[PDB]
């Protein structure tokens, strides 16, 4: 069946054992001699599968007929060797180990369930503190021990084993007390020591034994290798052993009968124990634990009266019960696992719900965090103790390969070393447990086992990262494999290396058509090799494919007929050209490859701007779409000639540029003369007579009688464009001379070049009348005019005719620029004579500032500001002088012509060449007092060059850091809007937004009409929500606003007939998981209603992110980032929370603004240095900024509502792109802003199972409310939320896309516990699974379309309904 959902959940220990084909018991990998896998190792064939297909390890079976059979000798299943990529193993841990994801991912999932803090959980898991599971009636410091209590090692030993301490004595002294004496705290055991605790005092090693015989004392010495066998006061019969020794000679036997008295103890051991002397046998033994009332020795006569551990003494003939409790306190994951096994989720939920009613907000918030975790386990069926591992899964060996390289050495993954460490520590623990090792040794091994598990799962997450010996490189764990830019998601799932691909340096293909590219034959032979082999076999080139491939292996064996067959292969087919970085979708375009000799790809000049490609070493990747779908998509949707308008703004992206503009500008600009300008005649013949004598020039403006004309208009009257251009070919007139030509039935006073340009457009579109309406004849053709012509031709004639027009403009633009005579000399950078005057004038005023500075009239900062303002004005005046000099004296100057036409250069760069370099900034940002007075033509001085070097380095450093920030922003935008697709024609909503045609202006305190480009960016292409009547024109509801309609609305706005336009927008769209066609409007790239299925969310993200590097970077890119991240502005403005009248109270100490209302008195303590923008008496609305600066978007949300923050975010983001001249349609921002407002917070659950403060999507709560209202239950009360693109993307329902963006450990930890089921709605999820994305041709709206001919259709019809 088809895969439709992906579910992630916790794996039970039983489930892990169900996956595994066997337990990996040895850390061995392969034999060092045979190089074959070892049995029970990490590569064992009996567990993971045969190394080679259908062959067992022993070799008994080597055939496919035994599929499914397991060899009786070797134990290896006879099957395909590829099972080693899928069959998993497991490691049976000696003791349970906690999964590090559910421990360290803040907030801890295990800690949240167990109400344990991170410090408390860390201490128990890593064997620093005990946790009490069963107190068993234990008392600590007088307080009874409770369950879940944390005990230190010292506290546990006191409870478990008791309290005792040995007190050493000085050498040669005797103890004051006797054996078995009930000493107390502070009592002196010996002259130099005092007992710090109360208990029974007993001698450890009596150095001297005094036996008083019965008839005299005998003092013996006890060597350190000797032991006294009788107690103090014992009755020793003559000859009985008293002190034992290794050799019988040193044995101290009694000479006669007497009583033994011990003396000179090595130390006194005072143990808090009760002694019970006994005479008969003992009913217990050392180590036994007895409660009060338990019989001890004499068959009932002697019974214990205190909790403790029994130690029977065979010399003192007493039973000592060291007071202690059998408390059940454990460490590690075993103690934690028992707590989660015994935790009742149903009971915990009820208790947490009761705490949810607590009046403290913090208590409710803490209860919500716990109850979200509890409900996640309850709903998914996950069992909380599964977060502690008993069986560790083993990755299949082919995913952690140990391979022999061609050199002969072996290469292995870091996981094998991580697995070996776990098995080595696990196996050692099993042997240590079997040997009955002390708890200290077992504690260390269990702690090391937990760290071994942690390193395997997430190395470096807790503690020092595990590294291999000889290097400091941390081992790559499972978490590292999946997370990060080098992880599995971002390196192998969201992007891949592909076959049928190539790469080469690009060169300009001037002769290419817009849909064509130059592909090297050698590349195409490799790129289309499988197709070529088939074609070679169809012809007589080769007998079959295998022979054909052998021919192509050697270059010298390739016949010339192969190249002819390659042409038939690539006929009609297209290739994909890609230049990195692919900032927008036109970074990949489809071209028909033209086979060319050489090794470079020829690229069309008109697509360079879309690729951001130049020819100074750029390289492009080539890709071959294989199937009919892939070829059809590239030829229809991705063809370069089919993508002429920018998807970001709707403006022509494939348009004349550089030499094409310059060549067309040169022939369309008219010459102006000054020889006889302003002179007047009486008759036209007199004017011509003056021209013959040379008094007046051909194009000098003159007046015949009362009309301003020129000699050329009268002297040369041409009957048709052909005659005018024939005169140019014969040299009578130039293309720039203004003459009289009859064209289109009109007597035009224009130049032949302008007439020539008209014929270029007319012949390109094959329509003379329409082309006349498409061009502006009486202006020189510059970048803006040529862009307008391309856009107008697109609307009136379509893509196919526009592509031909673009090629015609490119051909003539290149042709005329070559013969124009355009060059760059040192004298072309003309220095105006006004520069010297301005520099001298600035110097004179500079002395005035210095003279006033010495007079005290101004301060240091005032002098610094005065100098900067002086030089700023001087710099601007020189810029005007440079262009004024060009305008009146050198109208055809190369630098001037390039700047005016828009080909190359800007006025700032022209000034640095012809005027002065200007002011420079220090590394600290301060401007140098002295500017660079020399231009590049004159040449900078050594000092000036170094002064200018600070800015050049700063600009380059800014550029490098901006690309990373811009690229990071683009990825956030993609990952938050990737699911937004046009999924339906109309959602049926009646909501809309009103695009304002006027904006307030503070300098005049009034409404001023917005810029035309700004109105177009918010109105072009948008569907009218309500009918609009302007200037007698009825714009019906549902009308798509074309550029003419937008201009009509602007004209009506200037007439005062309209102030805002109600349009449908994505912000008000009700479509689930996307937008509707009506709420989106035009596909800006086609200037027509968007087609259902377009991934407009991806387009919006690329549209915003593409110009990110062009921002100057509260200003520039950082301003955009904080707006999309909904970050609170540092210089936060203060907005009124309510409406009313402001009342300022300024004082010498502080400032306070009061917004007085009818019965409300709000207070705002604004600082002294606060730039207020409101005065006393003004009525302010709620959320209106009292103080200048950036508004906090979150404060605006609660003050004014969701619509106010949405319009604020779109406007503020647009302001940044307006400053750099970037034209971005408001739709693209609104799609992202729509995702930023997608979630809401529950304020009152009502009659639902939701919690107060719970965050969920706005659609869900509205859908939930509909069912609640439909059955009479109380609806959920909620408030809107605003989050940044990063947080919004990470809170999406689909865990596959969220895990592939960021916080992979955090996303997967919560998804697995909640048992989340990804429904594969967005684009990223299907990319990961390699499925057809639900957009474009993969959208369900067009994917099931059938195609059939009439003959087949009638045949089916005539055969069924007959």
């Amino acid at each position: 069946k088809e895969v439709r959902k992906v579910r992630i959940a916790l794996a039970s220990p039983e489930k892990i054992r169900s996956w595994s084909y066997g337990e990996v018991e040895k850390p061995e990998t392969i034999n060092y001699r045979t190089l074959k896998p070892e049995r029970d190792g990490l590569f064992d064939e009996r567990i993971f599968g045969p190394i080679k297909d259908y062959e067992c390890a022993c070799g008994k079976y080597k055939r496919q007929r035994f599929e499914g059979k397991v060899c009786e000798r070797c134990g290896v299943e006879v099957t395909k060797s590829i099972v080693r990529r899928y069959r998993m193993g497991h490691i049976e841990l000696a003791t349970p180990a906690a999964h590090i994801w559910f421990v360290k991912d803040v907030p801890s999932k295990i800690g949240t369930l167990l109400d344990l803090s991170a410090t408390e959980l860390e201490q128990v898991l890593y064997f620093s503190k005990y946790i009490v599971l069963d107190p068993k009636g234990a008392i600590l410091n007088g307080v009874p021990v409770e369950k879940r209590q944390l005990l230190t090692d010292e506290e546990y030993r006191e409870l478990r084993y008791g309290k005792q301490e040995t007190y050493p004595l000085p050498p040669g002294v005797d103890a004051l007390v006797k054996d078995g004496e009930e000493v107390v705290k502070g009592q002196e055991l010996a002259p130099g020591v005092v007992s710090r605790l109360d208990g029974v005092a007993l001698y450890r090693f009596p150095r001297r034994v005094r036996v008083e015989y019965v008839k005299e004392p005998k003092d013996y010495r006890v060597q350190p290798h000797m032991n006294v066998v009788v107690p103090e006061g014992a009755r020793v019969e003559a000859g009985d052993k008293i002190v034992a020794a290794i050799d019988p000679e040193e044995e101290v036997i009694a000479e006669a009968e007497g009583v033994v008295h011990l003396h000179e103890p090595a130390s006194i051991l005072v143990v808090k124990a009760r002694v019970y002397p006994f005479e008969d046998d003992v009913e217990v033994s050392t180590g036994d634990r007895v409660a009060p009332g338990d019989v001890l020795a004499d068959g009932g006569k002697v019974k214990s009266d205190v909790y403790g551990r029994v130690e029977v003494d065979l010399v003192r003939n007493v039973v000592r019960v060291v007071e202690s409790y059998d408390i059940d306190a454990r460490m590690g994951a075993e103690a934690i696992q028992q707590l989660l096994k015994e935790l009742d989720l149903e009971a915990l939920e009820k208790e947490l719900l009761e705490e949810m009613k607590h009046p403290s907000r913090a208590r409710r918030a803490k209860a919500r965090k716990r109850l979200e975790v509890v409900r996640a386990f309850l709903d998914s069926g996950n069992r909380p103790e599964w977060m502690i591992l008993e069986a560790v899964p083993v990755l299949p060996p082919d995913l952690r390969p140990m391979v022999q390289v061609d050199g002969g050495r072996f290469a292995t993954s870091d996981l094998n070393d991580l697995y070996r460490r776990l098995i080595n520590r696990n196996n050692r623990l099993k042997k240590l447990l079997a040997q009955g090792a002390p708890e200290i040794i077992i504690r260390n091994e269990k702690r090391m086992l937990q760290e071994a598990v942690d390193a395997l799962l997430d190395n470096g997450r807790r503690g020092a990262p595990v590294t291999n010996p000889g290097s400091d490189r941390p081992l790559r764990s499972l978490t590292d494999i999946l997370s990060g830019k080098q992880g599995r998601f971002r390196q192998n799932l969201l992007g891949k290396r592909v076959d049928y691909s190539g790469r080469s340096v690009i060169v300009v293909g001037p002769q290419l058509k817009l849909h064509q590219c130059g592909l090297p034959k050698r590349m195409a032979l490799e790129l289309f090799k499988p197709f070529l082999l088939k074609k070679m076999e169809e012809k007589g080139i080769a007998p079959n494919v295998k022979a054909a491939r052998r021919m192509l292996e050697r270059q010298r064996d390739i016949k010339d007929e192969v190249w002819d067959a390659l042409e038939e292969v690539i006929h009609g087919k297209v290739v994909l050209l890609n230049r990195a970085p692919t900032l927008h979708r036109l970074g990949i375009q489809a071209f028909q490859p033209v086979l060319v000799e050489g090794q470079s790809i020829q690229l069309h000049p008109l697509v360079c701007e879309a690729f951001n490609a130049d020819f100074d070493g750029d390289q492009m990747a080539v890709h071959v779409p294989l199937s009919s779908f892939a070829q059809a998509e590239a030829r229809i949707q991705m063809l370069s000639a089919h993508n002429l308008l920018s998807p970001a703004s709707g403006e022509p992206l494939a348009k004349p540029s550089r030499d094409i503009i310059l060549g067309l500008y040169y022939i369309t600009q008219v010459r102006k003369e000054k020889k006889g300008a302003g002179l007047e005649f009486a008759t036209p013949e007199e004017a011509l007579a003056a021209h013959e004598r040379g008094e007046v020039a051909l194009n000098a403006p003159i007046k015949v009688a009362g009309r301003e004309t020129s000699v050329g208009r009268l002297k040369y009257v041409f009957a048709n464009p052909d005659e005018a251009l024939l005169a140019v070919a014969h040299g009578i007139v130039d293309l720039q001379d203004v003459v009289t030509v009859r064209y289109m039935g009109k007597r035009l006073e224009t130049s032949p070049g302008r007439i020539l340009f008209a014929r270029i457009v007319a012949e390109a579109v094959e329509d003379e009348k329409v082309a006349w309406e498409l061009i502006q004849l009486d202006v020189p053709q510059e970048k803006n005019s040529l862009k307008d012509l391309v856009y107008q031709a697109f609307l009136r004639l379509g893509m196919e005719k526009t592509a031909r027009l673009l090629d015609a403009l490119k051909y003539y633009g290149f042709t005329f620029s070559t013969t124009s005579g355009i060059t760059i000399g040192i004298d072309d950078a003309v220095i105006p004579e006004e520069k010297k005057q301005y520099l001298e004038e600035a110097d004179r005023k500079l002395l005035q500032i210095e003279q006033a500075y010495e007079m005290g009239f101004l301060t240091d900062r005032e002098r610094y500001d005065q100098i900067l303002q002086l030089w700023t004005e001087t710099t601007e005046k020189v810029t005007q002088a440079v262009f004024k000099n060009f305008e009146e004296n050198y109208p055809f100057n190369p630098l001037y012509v390039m700047a005016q036409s828009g080909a190359r250069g800007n006025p700032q760069q022209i000034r640095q060449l012809c005027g002065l370099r200007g002011l420079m900034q220090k590394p600290s940002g301060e401007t140098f007092e002295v500017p660079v007075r020399s231009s590049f033509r004159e040449g900078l001085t050594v000092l000036e060059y170094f002064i200018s070097s600070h800015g050049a380095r700063k600009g380059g450093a800014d550029t490098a850091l901006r690309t990373a920030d811009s690229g990071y922003l683009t990825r956030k935008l993609v990952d938050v809007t990737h699911e937004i697709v046009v999924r339906e024609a109309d959602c049926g909503t009646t909501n809309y937004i009103s695009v304002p045609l006027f904006q307030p202006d503070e300098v005049t305190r009034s409404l001023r009409l917005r810029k035309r480009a700004d109105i177009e960016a918010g109105l072009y292409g948008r569907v009218l929500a309500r009918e609009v009547e302007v200037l007698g024109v009825r714009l019906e509801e549902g009308r798509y606003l074309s550029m003419d309609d937008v201009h009509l609305l602007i004209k009506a706005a200037e007439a005062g007939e309209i102030q805002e336009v109600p349009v449908r927008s994505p912000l008000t769209c009700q479509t689930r998981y996307g937008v509707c066609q009506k709420c989106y409007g035009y596909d800006l790239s086609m200037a027509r209603p968007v087609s259902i299925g377009e991934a407009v969310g991806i387009v919006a993200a690329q549209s915003i992110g593409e110009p990110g590097t062009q921002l100057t970077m509260t200003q520039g890119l950082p301003r955009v980032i904080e707006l999309f991240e909904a970050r609170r502005p540092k210089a936060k403005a203060v907005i009124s929370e309510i409406d009313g009248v402001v009342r300022i109270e300024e004082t010498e100490e502080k400032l306070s603004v009061f917004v007085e209302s009818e019965g409300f008195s709000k207070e705002y303590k604004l600082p002294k240095e606060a730039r207020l923008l409101v005065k006393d008496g003004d009525y302010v609305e709620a959320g209106q900024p009292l103080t200048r600066g950036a508004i906090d978007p979150h404060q605006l949300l609660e003050a004014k509502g969701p619509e106010a923050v949405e319009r604020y975010l779109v406007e503020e983001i647009q302001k940044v792109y307006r400053a750099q001249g970037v034209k971005l349609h408001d739709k693209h921002i609104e799609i992202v802003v729509r995702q930023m407002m997608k979630y809401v917070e529950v304020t009152d659950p009502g009659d639902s199972r939701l919690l107060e403060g719970q965050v969920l999507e706005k659609w869900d709560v509205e859908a939930l409310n509909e069912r609640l209202i439909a059955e009479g239950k109380t609806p959920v009360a909620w408030k809107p939320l605003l989050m940044g693109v990063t947080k919004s993307a990470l809170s999406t329902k689909s865990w596959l896309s969220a895990a592939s963006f960021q916080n992979t450990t955090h996303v997967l930890t919560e998804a697995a516990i909640a048992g989340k089921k990804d429904e594969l709605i967005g684009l990223k999820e299907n990319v990961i699974l390699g499925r057809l994305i639900p957009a474009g041709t993969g959208s369900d709206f067009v994917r099931f379309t059938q195609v059939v001919d009439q003959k087949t259709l009638k045949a089916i019809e005539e055969a069924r309904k007959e």
Binding site: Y32, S81, P224, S285, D288, R289, R409, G436, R473, R549
Partner: protein, 333 residues
């Protein structure tokens, strides 16, 4: 956060033993072990079974049968219950004797770092040798515990390094051979002032060694290289990105196999119904396994010489067909 410092603190809470305490604990373990032997000889059960039951009670916390065996031992009379007491005290003395010598292993283990095992691994392996030292220690010889324990602690650390310090495990004999080769080569290097040649190293090693054996031993001593080793300053490339997969067939290899299969069955169509069956059955084109003329003599009931008679005849006819069409030679390579 520091496991080593945490362990050192834990072992620091057990005071070091005086010589009097050391002898007393050592004596009790030997007496306890002898008591277990006496108990088993009388009670009749496995001596190893009894020591686990005694050890279980001392440690505390199959539990069904441990109580049953412990109760049976306590059911013995007074004379026999005494031997149980020494067994309990002997096992408790063993636990305390091991705990008080955990400082000795750390001092020994710190001299073995940098040899493929972490410091904590060396200590835990050294602890295993320390436990073995207690079992085999004899206080009758009047030697101190550290004198005899040092041999077992160092032994356990050495064996662990020879067994666990390499991804590809190498036996102790070859590890000790590899160690000798390095030591010999280093000694020759410092005396000759240059890197020794394989002939020079073999001669210094002794009889049975030539330059061939030295080179093979060095080849064996080559540790595998990590697949995640970065190349260049940038942390964006590893060795694994440059190692092709030579196991799975390439698309070209898979295609030519299919091309050969369809051309071979097309050529076999010209053969007779039985003649083509024999070759497909003898060459394993149907069942996948080459059969014997006998295994085919049962499918059709014919003689092993019948098949060899026709199998060649069908083979010869394919040779004639191939020479006439030449549509099958290019697959031969």
């Amino acid at each position: 956060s520091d496991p080593v410092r945490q362990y050192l603190h834990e072992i620091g809470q057990v005071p070091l033993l005086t010589l009097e305490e050391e002898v007393e604990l050592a004596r009790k373990v030997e007496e306890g072990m002898e008591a277990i032997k006496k108990l088993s000889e009388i009670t009749g059960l496995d001596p190893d079974l009894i020591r686990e039951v005694v050890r279980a009670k001392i440690l505390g916390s199959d539990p069904k049968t441990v109580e049953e065996i412990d109760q049976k031992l306590k059911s013995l009379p007074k004379e026999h219950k005494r031997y149980l007491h020494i067994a309990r005290e002997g096992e408790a003395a063993r636990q305390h004797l091991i705990e008080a010598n955990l400082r000795l292993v750390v001092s020994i283990a710190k001299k073995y770092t940098g040899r493929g095992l972490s410091f904590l691994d060396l200590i835990q392996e050294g602890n295993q040798g320390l436990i073995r030292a207690v079992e085999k220690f004899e206080y009758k010889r009047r030697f101190k515990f550290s004198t005899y324990a040092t041999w077992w602690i160092r032994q356990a650390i050495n064996r662990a390094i020879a067994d666990q310090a390499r991804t590809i495990r190498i036996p102790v004999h070859m590890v000790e051979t590899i160690n000798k080769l390095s030591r010999t080569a280093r000694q020759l290097q410092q005396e000759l002032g240059r890197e020794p040649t394989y002939e020079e190293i073999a001669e210094a090693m002794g009889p049975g060694w030539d330059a061939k054996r030295v080179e093979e031993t060095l080849k064996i001593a080559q540790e595998p290289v990590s697949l995640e080793t970065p190349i260049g300053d940038e942390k964006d490339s590893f060795y694994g990105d440059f190692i092709p997969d030579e196991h799975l067939p390439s698309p070209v290899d898979a295609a030519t196999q299919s091309l050969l299969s369809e051309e071979l069955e097309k050529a076999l169509s010209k053969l007779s119904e039985r003649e083509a069956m024999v070759l497909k059955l003898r060459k394993g084109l149907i069942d996948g396994r080459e059969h014997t003329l006998e295994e085919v003599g049962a499918f059709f009931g014919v003689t092993r010489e019948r098949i060899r008679q026709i199998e060649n005849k069908a083979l010869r006819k394919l040779k004639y067909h191939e020479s006439r069409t030449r549509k099958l030679r290019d697959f031969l390579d």
